[PDB]
Scaffold this active site. Structure first.
Site, PDB file in Angstrom:
ATOM      1  N   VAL A 197       6.865 -24.001  20.961  1.00  0.00           N
ATOM      2  CA  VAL A 197       6.826 -22.911  20.018  1.00  0.00           C
ATOM      3  C   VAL A 197       7.026 -23.627  18.690  1.00  0.00           C
ATOM      4  CG1 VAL A 197       7.868 -20.752  19.290  1.00  0.00           C
ATOM      5  CG2 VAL A 197       7.960 -21.405  21.690  1.00  0.00           C
TER       6      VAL A 197
ATOM      7  N   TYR B 292       3.567 -24.555  26.009  1.00  0.00           N
ATOM      8  CA  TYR B 292       5.012 -24.539  26.212  1.00  0.00           C
ATOM      9  C   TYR B 292       5.734 -24.441  24.863  1.00  0.00           C
ATOM     10  CZ  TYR B 292       4.404 -29.730  25.706  1.00  0.00           C
ATOM     11  OH  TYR B 292       4.002 -30.975  25.272  1.00  0.00           O
TER      12      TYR B 292
ATOM     13  N   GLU C 244      11.259 -36.184  15.148  1.00  0.00           N
ATOM     14  CA  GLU C 244      11.268 -36.488  13.737  1.00  0.00           C
ATOM     15  C   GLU C 244      10.136 -35.656  13.186  1.00  0.00           C
ATOM     16  OE1 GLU C 244       9.349 -39.817  12.205  1.00  0.00           O
ATOM     17  OE2 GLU C 244       8.486 -40.476  14.102  1.00  0.00           O
ATOM     18  N   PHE C 245      10.420 -34.899  12.140  1.00  0.00           N
ATOM     19  CA  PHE C 245       9.419 -34.073  11.506  1.00  0.00           C
ATOM     20  C   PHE C 245       8.482 -34.899  10.654  1.00  0.00           C
ATOM     21  CE2 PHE C 245       7.669 -32.178   7.837  1.00  0.00           C
ATOM     22  CZ  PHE C 245       7.036 -31.075   8.378  1.00  0.00           C
TER      23      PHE C 245
ATOM     24  N   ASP D 296      -4.448 -37.481  25.763  1.00  0.00           N
ATOM     25  CA  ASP D 296      -4.725 -36.292  24.941  1.00  0.00           C
ATOM     26  C   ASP D 296      -4.845 -36.682  23.496  1.00  0.00           C
ATOM     27  OD1 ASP D 296      -5.477 -33.652  24.671  1.00  0.00           O
ATOM     28  OD2 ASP D 296      -3.481 -32.774  25.078  1.00  0.00           O
TER      29      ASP D 296
HETATM   30  N1  LIG Z   1       6.966 -34.192  14.442  1.00  0.00           N
HETATM   31  C1  LIG Z   1       6.256 -33.138  14.152  1.00  0.00           C
HETATM   32  N2  LIG Z   1       6.227 -32.701  12.891  1.00  0.00           N
HETATM   33  C2  LIG Z   1       5.535 -31.616  12.607  1.00  0.00           C
HETATM   34  N3  LIG Z   1       4.838 -30.857  13.432  1.00  0.00           N
HETATM   35  C3  LIG Z   1       4.891 -31.330  14.699  1.00  0.00           C
HETATM   36  C4  LIG Z   1       5.552 -32.441  15.139  1.00  0.00           C
HETATM   37  N4  LIG Z   1       5.389 -32.647  16.519  1.00  0.00           N
HETATM   38  C5  LIG Z   1       4.644 -31.632  16.830  1.00  0.00           C
HETATM   39  N5  LIG Z   1       4.299 -30.785  15.786  1.00  0.00           N
HETATM   40  C6  LIG Z   1       3.455 -29.561  15.721  1.00  0.00           C
HETATM   41  O1  LIG Z   1       3.169 -28.867  16.963  1.00  0.00           O
HETATM   42  C7  LIG Z   1       1.809 -29.263  17.199  1.00  0.00           C
HETATM   43  C8  LIG Z   1       1.482 -29.584  18.683  1.00  0.00           C
HETATM   44  O2  LIG Z   1       1.617 -30.848  19.439  1.00  0.00           O
HETATM   45  P1  LIG Z   1       2.936 -30.688  20.368  1.00  0.00           P
HETATM   46  O3  LIG Z   1       2.956 -31.838  21.251  1.00  0.00           O
HETATM   47  O4  LIG Z   1       4.062 -30.360  19.496  1.00  0.00           O
HETATM   48  O5  LIG Z   1       2.527 -29.443  21.317  1.00  0.00           O
HETATM   49  P2  LIG Z   1       2.724 -27.813  21.620  1.00  0.00           P
HETATM   50  O6  LIG Z   1       1.623 -27.102  20.893  1.00  0.00           O
HETATM   51  O7  LIG Z   1       4.126 -27.307  21.801  1.00  0.00           O
HETATM   52  O8  LIG Z   1       2.187 -28.016  23.060  1.00  0.00           O
HETATM   53  P3  LIG Z   1       0.885 -28.867  23.524  1.00  0.00           P
HETATM   54  O9  LIG Z   1       1.423 -30.023  24.341  1.00  0.00           O
HETATM   55  O10 LIG Z   1       0.114 -27.857  24.356  1.00  0.00           O
HETATM   56  O11 LIG Z   1       0.182 -29.331  22.211  1.00  0.00           O
HETATM   57  C9  LIG Z   1       1.414 -30.471  16.374  1.00  0.00           C
HETATM   58  O12 LIG Z   1      -0.019 -30.522  16.221  1.00  0.00           O
HETATM   59  C10 LIG Z   1       2.142 -30.172  15.099  1.00  0.00           C
HETATM   60  O13 LIG Z   1       1.373 -29.236  14.301  1.00  0.00           O
END
Ligand SMILES: Nc1ncnc2c1ncn2[C@@H]1O[C@H](COP(=O)(O)OP(=O)(O)OP(=O)(O)O)[C@@H](O)[C@H]1O
Ligand SMILES: Nc1ncnc2c1ncn2[C@@H]1O[C@H](COP(=O)(O)OP(=O)(O)OP(=O)(O)O)[C@@H](O)[C@H]1O
Ligand SMILES: [Mn+2]
Ligand SMILES: [Mn+2]
Lengths: 298, 258, 258, 298
Positions: free
Chosen positions: D17, D15, D81-82, D127
């Site tokens: 991006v 989902y 939060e990044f 997960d």
């Molecule tokens: N707070 C964050 N800061 C930086 N990167 C993030 C953060 N949250 C998520 N991400 C990036 O997106 C990646 C994926 O986990 P996230 O839950 O965001 O899923 P997604 O790829 O959109 O969907 P899925 O649930 O299938 O993983 C993280 O491993 C990280 O690399």
């Protein structure tokens, strides 16, 4: 903002135009006050800031409900509960009729309820008049247009001078008194009350002096006995004609002993002795109060 | 018009808790600090004097600020933009005649643009969900003062002086409700000027006691005491004016005896 | 078991109070009423029967519906759309396999479109602000069920049956916490099936006593006694069922003697 | 949304991006998980529904901060939060050196605490894997990605068939057991712990049976003695090769007695016996935890 279907143009004012609309999803009819801001100009207008912020605290069956505020980058939509007529037009269509005493009393009752609520949450409306009081098809009346409203302090400070549409402006303000407060709204309500009965504006002055003079002629020129301090007020002139106080029953002929009393207390000169909304609720005028439901004309 | 005093006091007491900012926000906050914030509020005191704003507007701006920062991270270079937007809002809300947005852009001397100030205004509005009618220390002070017998303008202005001083420092006042600080400010003023203490009629009214006020009183006292050597000095230099009876010149109690 | 069981109970007990809808919101709803609400909840019961949704999903659906209607004015005509969307959401949150939107649109039998249902779903999400993890009578009944020795399936089905009869009637149920209804619903079942009452174990856990749970129990017993002649009958039907051991067919106590 | 400047792109998949953005007014940097709604088909995804409702109900320093949810007609961006990077990237980076044990103990300490918070709030993550765990420049690691999380009820019911990423999937799942609980997360985390120490996945199955067998080969094939009931589960075969348990010093070499102790408990066949986050936190291994800063490349 996509769950609304515009249905017409209602009443435009300050911020922008007001449309009628229906939530395509729940069916609820609403009024959409819009604001394009002042993007590369003033910014969000103070009236909208006072109106939205104060209106979002006043939840009461007798104050129009701000259901939501839709924020977009270039427009601000204020979603209000929809009300059919305003007192002004209602009375206009009451040709012959006359608003029957039961409805006047009901309406007066509701207005005090909603106004006492505003005063309890340190909010001065400062713009009561029949245009600003909206009625619905269920026998309800509610205060509207809090654009002139302002949150007050205890004790009050000197607030914006000359507020309230002339005809409904209180004597305190016309004499340019330093501080005004909650009593100002009670004066406007006393005037609307006499107006619902007589179907005519109580003090239809054309200038401030004409206004004072109509006020004085009907309630008498106040002196230090009746209003300790009048004579030293900024706009009090010793040259003022001193009129005798007219017999109250002649002020609003159709009114009974009770309604006369309430009105005399609402139209009391000294703002310190002028009756409070809160206290007006317990007056004998309202002992038989009901909720007559009027048939609207739209 | 005392007819509404207690409904209003009770209402404000209720709302003050809803406008309460996250008392631990600076810790979690990444680039700005208490000291930077103290620098910002002081400047705002100047802006209030420049444009002759009301004190309530000062208090309101600061309230908005602490609430914004309680949920929004801000860069040190971006903090005055927040401060100016909150000050602008506080102005439109409280002033009869608020400064035009050009004046506000001018005071953040060459720093920000007006579209920037305007966009921040819209954002402070979004974050604060338009909840701007916030209870301030000044709103309570103003009510308390009604319990003076008799009224002493020097106690009044001093109380105000101290209540404002609490604005500068998030540590420790970000944990005290306005009403408490207004109670500490008032007592400490009354005492410093007339030897009198927190009135019984205020205990009835507020329910607060000298002992409920101790924590905050201890703090306010030290602040009053160290005032002459605080990095920021706008409020001291402001309360020298006859308008406030030059109470900043008054000497604080060496002790409180509580 | 050993650690979280309490944390969880405790947590839920905290949230249930935050998740409450205005108890008299219907009086402020101009076109809909508790009867129409009953019609709606009963239909939902039928829908869960239909798609075999978990009982917990039914509970969530009504939760979201009371919270939505407590904030949004709705017309009798769109009332079922608020239901379909509320069920949609509860299914996505609760079920392993929730019916697709096509199924949810089909049950309204051409009354609404798939776009309306989908548009209402987003609206119910905005209004409820994404807070869907609502505590329910079912959750609490579930924990309480652990404290029954021996475990009487009939008592479980009966308790399930009782707290489900509560979903239908806003008046008076809307004024009780899920935990309490769970309790009253529990005790009433244990007694109706096995002459026993609210266990101290459960009392130490909940802090509920047969007399603190009395008002609810008093209503719950009447509701139980009049079940046969209530306009709504899907819960009786669903509970004559074999996997509910025809608990509906059972005979409610004429008295309790609390 | 007009306040965010899209900087980089990150975890785009399923989902999200996931872009890295900065608020043009505050300077704050966020991580925007854009989600695509099926406006004319499926509507808002269940993933988003559970993830958002639970995350905005989990306030702890070891759970990523969801800052806002931007609600448009056609899109839905989660503003988080990044945090600098996931544990999967920090790990790859640490190839050649390894994550220092003192930082490891620290990371696992923080995870157990965040997990304990989820569990005490009836929420299953489901997960847990390096990529879904994020770290910052100061020594903090937070649980992220709640797209697979679910709020549980006591006692637990029958939840979604085989969830969790294969490599970190616990035996109960694999063996098709009827219900699962907070223990499935303990396993995953356990596997993560070894992975941090041995710098390699503990059980890199290339299938459900391979996965089963890699688990068995290491921990020994479970019997009714070690896990009363194994023999009776839907996916258990009497034709399972009965492997013998390996000395834990063989399993995770750098680990000490406590480490091997805490680990043996986070990898207990019998879930009912498998250590809890609350308990693990107590565990001796932690007796001397600090909060080392990782040498980032951020
Ligand atoms: N707070 C964050 N800061 C930086 N990167 C993030 C953060 N949250 C998520 N991400 C990036 O997106 C990646 C994926 O986990 P996230 O839950 O965001 O899923 P997604 O790829 O959109 O969907 P899925 O649930 O299938 O993983 C993280 O491993 C990280 O690399
Ligand atoms: N909630 C509403 N329901 C029905 N009509 C409304 C509503 N709000 C505005 N209108 C109509 O528009 C006319 C103008 O009144 P209102 O005072 O509410 O706002 P406005 O004039 O658009 O803006 P301002 O607040 O600046 O005066 C009213 O007489 C009223 O009939
Ligand atoms: Mn108007
Ligand atoms: Mn991921």
């Amino acid at each position: 903002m996509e769950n609304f279907q515009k249905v017409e143009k209602i009443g435009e004012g300050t911020y922008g135009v007001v449309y009628k609309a229906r939530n395509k999803l729940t069916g609820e009819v609403v009024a959409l006050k819009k604001i394009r801001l002042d993007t590369e100009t003033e910014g969000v207008p103070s009236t909208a800031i006072r109106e939205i912020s104060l209106l979002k605290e006043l939840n009461h069956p007798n104050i129009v409900k701000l259901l939501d505020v839709i924020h977009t980058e270039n427009k601000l939509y204020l979603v209000f509960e929809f009300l059919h007529q305003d007192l002004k037009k209602f009375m206009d269509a009451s040709a012959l009729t006359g608003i029957p005493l039961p409805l006047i009393k009901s309406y007066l009752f509701q207005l005090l309820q909603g106004l006492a609520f505003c005063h309890s949450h340190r909010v001065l409306h400062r713009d009561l008049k029949p245009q600003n009081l909206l009625i619905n098809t269920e026998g309800a009346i509610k205060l509207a247009d809090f654009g002139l409203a302002r949150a007050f302090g205890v004790p009050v400070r000197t607030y914006t001078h000359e507020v309230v549409t002339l005809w409904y402006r209180a004597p305190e303000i016309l004499l340019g008194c330093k501080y005004y407060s909650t009593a100002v709204d009670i004066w406007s309500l006393g005037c609307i009350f006499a107006e619902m009965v007589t179907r005519r504006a109580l003090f239809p002055g054309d200038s401030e002096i004409d206004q004072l003079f109509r006020i004085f002629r009907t309630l008498g020129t106040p002196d230090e006995v009746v209003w300790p301090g009048v004579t030293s007020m900024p706009d009090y002139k010793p040259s003022f004609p001193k009129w005798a106080r007219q017999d109250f029953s002649k002020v609003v002929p159709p009114l009974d002993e009770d309604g006369r009393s309430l009105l005399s207390q609402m139209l009391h000169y000294d703002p310190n002795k002028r009756i409070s909304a809160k206290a007006a609720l317990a007056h004998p005028f309202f002992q038989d109060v009901t909720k007559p439901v009027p048939h609207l004309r739209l | 018009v005392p007819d509404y005093h207690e409904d209003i006091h009770t209402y404000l007491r209720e709302m003050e808790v809803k406008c309460k900012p996250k008392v631990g926000y600076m810790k979690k906050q990444p680039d700005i600090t208490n000291s930077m914030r103290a620098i910002l509020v002081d400047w705002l005191v100047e802006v209030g004097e420049e444009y002759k704003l009301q004190n309530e507007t000062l208090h309101l701006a600061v309230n908005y600020i602490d609430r914004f920062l309680s949920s929004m991270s801000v860069l040190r270079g971006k903090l005055q933009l927040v401060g100016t937007a909150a000050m602008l809002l506080a102005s439109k809300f409280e002033e009869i005649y608020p400064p035009e947005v050009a004046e506000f852009v001018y005071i953040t001397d060459d720093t920000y643009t007006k579209k920037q100030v305007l966009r921040m205004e819209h954002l402070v509005l979004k974050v604060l969900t338009f909840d701007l009618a916030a209870p301030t220390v000044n709103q309570f002070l103003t009510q308390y003062f009604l319990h003076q017998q008799p009224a002493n303008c020097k106690v009044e202005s001093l109380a105000m002086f101290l209540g404002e001083l609490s604005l500068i420092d998030a540590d420790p006042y970000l944990k005290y409700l306005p009403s408490v600080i207004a109670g500490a400010a008032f007592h400490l003023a009354l005492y410093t000027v007339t030897g009198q203490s927190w009135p019984e009629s205020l205990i009835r009214k507020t329910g607060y006691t000298l002992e409920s006020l101790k924590p905050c009183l201890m703090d306010l006292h030290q602040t009053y005491l160290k005032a002459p050597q605080h990095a920021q000095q706008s409020i001291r230099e402001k309360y020298k004016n006859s308008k406030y009876h030059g109470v900043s010149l008054l000497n604080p109690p060496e002790t409180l005896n509580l």
